[PDB]
Design an enzyme around this catalytic site. Structure first.
Site, PDB file in Angstrom:
ATOM      1  N   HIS A 103       0.815  -1.208   0.000  1.00  0.00           N
ATOM      2  CA  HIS A 103       0.000   0.000   0.000  1.00  0.00           C
ATOM      3  C   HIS A 103       0.848   1.257   0.000  1.00  0.00           C
ATOM      4  CE1 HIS A 103       0.677   1.036   4.214  1.00  0.00           C
ATOM      5  NE2 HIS A 103       0.283  -0.165   4.607  1.00  0.00           N
ATOM      6  N   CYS A 132       4.090   1.560   9.311  1.00  0.00           N
ATOM      7  CA  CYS A 132       3.955   0.397   8.450  1.00  0.00           C
ATOM      8  C   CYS A 132       5.308  -0.030   7.936  1.00  0.00           C
ATOM      9  CB  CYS A 132       3.032   0.713   7.281  1.00  0.00           C
ATOM     10  SG  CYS A 132       1.353   0.802   7.811  1.00  0.00           S
ATOM     11  N   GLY A 185       3.014   6.201   9.897  1.00  0.00           N
ATOM     12  CA  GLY A 185       4.368   5.952   9.472  1.00  0.00           C
ATOM     13  C   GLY A 185       4.999   4.693  10.030  1.00  0.00           C
TER      14      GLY A 185
HETATM   15  C1  UED Z   1       0.983   2.522   7.783  1.00  0.00           C
HETATM   16  O1  UED Z   1       2.012   3.387   8.161  1.00  0.00           O
HETATM   17  C2  UED Z   1      -0.257   2.801   8.622  1.00  0.00           C
HETATM   18  C3  UED Z   1      -0.122   2.418  10.124  1.00  0.00           C
HETATM   19  C4  UED Z   1      -1.440   2.814  10.901  1.00  0.00           C
HETATM   20  C5  UED Z   1      -1.682   4.341  10.845  1.00  0.00           C
HETATM   21  C6  UED Z   1      -2.170   4.800  12.153  1.00  0.00           C
HETATM   22  N1  UED Z   1      -1.868   3.692  13.125  1.00  0.00           N
HETATM   23  C7  UED Z   1      -1.419   2.502  12.309  1.00  0.00           C
HETATM   24  O2  UED Z   1      -1.156   1.450  12.768  1.00  0.00           O
HETATM   25  N2  UED Z   1      -1.321   2.011   7.920  1.00  0.00           N
HETATM   26  C8  UED Z   1      -2.615   2.617   7.553  1.00  0.00           C
HETATM   27  O3  UED Z   1      -2.778   3.771   7.795  1.00  0.00           O
HETATM   28  C9  UED Z   1      -3.763   1.847   6.846  1.00  0.00           C
HETATM   29  C10 UED Z   1      -3.488   1.983   5.387  1.00  0.00           C
HETATM   30  C11 UED Z   1      -3.432   0.599   4.741  1.00  0.00           C
HETATM   31  C12 UED Z   1      -4.509  -0.444   5.073  1.00  0.00           C
HETATM   32  C13 UED Z   1      -3.737   0.876   3.233  1.00  0.00           C
HETATM   33  N3  UED Z   1      -5.010   2.459   7.261  1.00  0.00           N
HETATM   34  C14 UED Z   1      -5.419   2.281   8.638  1.00  0.00           C
HETATM   35  O4  UED Z   1      -4.747   1.573   9.310  1.00  0.00           O
HETATM   36  O5  UED Z   1      -6.560   2.969   9.140  1.00  0.00           O
HETATM   37  C15 UED Z   1      -6.562   3.194  10.551  1.00  0.00           C
HETATM   38  C16 UED Z   1      -6.050   4.603  10.959  1.00  0.00           C
HETATM   39  C17 UED Z   1      -6.035   4.963  12.308  1.00  0.00           C
HETATM   40  C18 UED Z   1      -5.584   6.220  12.703  1.00  0.00           C
HETATM   41  C19 UED Z   1      -5.145   7.124  11.749  1.00  0.00           C
HETATM   42  C20 UED Z   1      -5.155   6.775  10.399  1.00  0.00           C
HETATM   43  C21 UED Z   1      -5.600   5.516  10.008  1.00  0.00           C
END
Ligand code: UED
Ligand code: UED
Lengths: 303, 303
Positions: free
Chosen positions: A41, A145, A143
């Site tokens: 992603h 991931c 950030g």
């Molecule tokens: C990748 O860096 C990120 C890690 C998440 C971001 C906030 N806490 C984490 O563990 N992954 C994502 O943002 C993910 C995107 C992929 C599935 C395409 N979306 C997600 O995890 O939604 C939950 C979220 C929670 C709080 C803020 C933003 C997104």
């Protein structure tokens, strides 16, 4: 006579972490010999993440559309490919600091350390367990991931988890290093949720044996149960059922301690049916379940 | 929306750990540039440790009476000396993997990571805090002496603790990297005991702000207290008194959150006087005190 959550030393993995940047999306990846593993992603944009077709997105990308840093140095991508939910990026350099290593798929209940990273650079380390609903109770900011999880077994790093996402309840989900997700999750900004979690009975029992090995015996008792009768209360307190396989695993611990498995079971049934009377086991007021029988043996020794 | 105990990544310190062997006594030491730091009791024998005179013991030793391994390699000692409860050993090699570093004496309440080692080789890492009675609630087996504790602040390792001994209650004691003990302990197999411990109020408050920053506000309240009136209950629940300095430190946290310090105090007084009603804060059922205001800020962000 003390005992706690311990993470594996993290030096062997620090030397493999790198930045991967693709438009306005930046995350971490894992540089083993001439390959860099990272969540796929990383190629979506903001819009894209609700409903991506990663086939579609990736034929649009070139080896040059991926930027990779290792501290200062920029790394040349000379190949790319998709393995289910990871990209594999080929680079012109073998990481000189690559350890002996393996990719493992862990089973639920098992524990591992995670090295939390941001913008390619390690930030912290902590110990975690794969829940039975296939999530983990992590600590992960935007950030994170690409951060990985791992065990070490005689100088050999066993990678088992790459971080992809946080579920609405605050728990985390991801894949092994072959890109297959743990659990029924998909790498999509959609309506997904963690299923009902349960307590890992095997580990709770493992920890009570640790409590005895550290001198402490207040919760033991004279009563005893059968496997069947113990599971009837496991169900109604939301504990995983106990199986003959789990009983067998607690063999060395029960041998070192003198306490047959089903007596420790009867102790636990007693602790469940009557709480714990403002008491603690190994400094905890609660039944704790993120230590395996193998963690317990690793740490301690003596009764 | 998740939050826990995180240790510093440990690679910069792994590369400095070495074996030090002296007769039948083997422990760890710390190889910075051309010097190796280690506890001085490495020169006692079994008998010796009840009442050593380390002056007496050390004039009997030669540079050759100290054996030092770094994995395979043996290291040549070419000088030795005593700085209070540590020996400094000179070697013919500068550790090529020595980081930017400092020696710091920590104050009570402050946290650090410890890298637990045996026979010169890292075994685990975990996060710890210096109690107000100057011990730490560690996890340390025979052979752990010389293990160090440390923080990292922009690539620079701040060493603050070397491990020397376990007290009868299972807690641990040691020194800074200048050999001065934390606490009134001495490096002697004699009758010593930890004094009464108390809860670190500053950190408990820090963690409640973390609870609010992670969305959670159930324990807050309308009431309020003065500093004096709050300390009257701090005393009778064995919490350190709160000081204007501590109130000032919680400034950024109270600003980010909207909640004045004395209101969070009133919340805590409420939580103390009425327990917590089968409730949890950040997954814990207890008031937890091993996170500083600075740990809290490090980890999280958002309300
Ligand atoms: C990748 O860096 C990120 C890690 C998440 C971001 C906030 N806490 C984490 O563990 N992954 C994502 O943002 C993910 C995107 C992929 C599935 C395409 N979306 C997600 O995890 O939604 C939950 C979220 C929670 C709080 C803020 C933003 C997104
Ligand atoms: C140094 O490796 C060792 C670490 C102790 C050993 C057991 N758990 C630890 O933290 N230090 C000592 O053994 C210390 C000797 C110096 C003060 C001279 N003696 C000590 O700590 O007594 C407590 C003890 C507890 C359990 C087994 C043996 C000793």
């Amino acid at each position: 006579s003390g005992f706690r959550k311990m993470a594996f030393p993290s030096g062997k993995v620090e030397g493999c972490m790198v930045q991967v940047t693709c438009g306005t999306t930046t995350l971490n990846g894992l540089w083993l010999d001439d390959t860099v593993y990272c969540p796929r992603h990383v190629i979506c944009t903001a819009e894209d993440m609700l409903n991506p077709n990663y086939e579609d997105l990736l034929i649009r990308k070139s080896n040059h559309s991926f930027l990779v840093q290792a501290g200062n140095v920029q790394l040349r991508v000379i190949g790319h490919s998709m393995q289910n939910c990871l990209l594999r990026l080929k680079v012109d350099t073998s990481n000189p600091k690559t350890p002996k290593y393996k990719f493992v798929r862990i089973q639920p209940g098992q524990t591992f350390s995670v090295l939390a990273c941001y913008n390619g650079s390690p930030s912290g380390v902590y110990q975690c367990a794969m829940r039975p609903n296939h999530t983990i109770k992590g600590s992960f900011l935007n950030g994170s991931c690409g951060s990985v999880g791992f065990n070490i077994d005689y100088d050999c790093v066993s990678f088992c988890y790459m971080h992809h996402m946080e579920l609405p309840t605050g728990v985390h989900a991801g894949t092994d290093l072959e890109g297959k997700f743990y659990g029924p999750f998909v790498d999509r900004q959609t309506a997904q949720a963690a299923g009902t979690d349960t307590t890992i009975t095997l580990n709770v029992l493992a920890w009570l044996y640790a409590a005895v090995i550290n001198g402490d015996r207040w919760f033991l008792n004279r009563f005893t149960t059968t496997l069947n009768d113990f599971n009837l209360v496991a169900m109604k307190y939301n504990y995983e059922p106990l199986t003959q396989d789990h009983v067998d695993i607690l063999g060395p611990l029960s041998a070192q301690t003198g306490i047959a498995v089903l007596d420790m079971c009867a102790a636990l049934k007693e602790l469940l049916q009557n709480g714990m009377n403002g008491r603690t086991i190994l400094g905890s007021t609660i039944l704790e379940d993120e230590f395996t029988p193998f963690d317990v043996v690793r740490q301690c020794s003596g009764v």
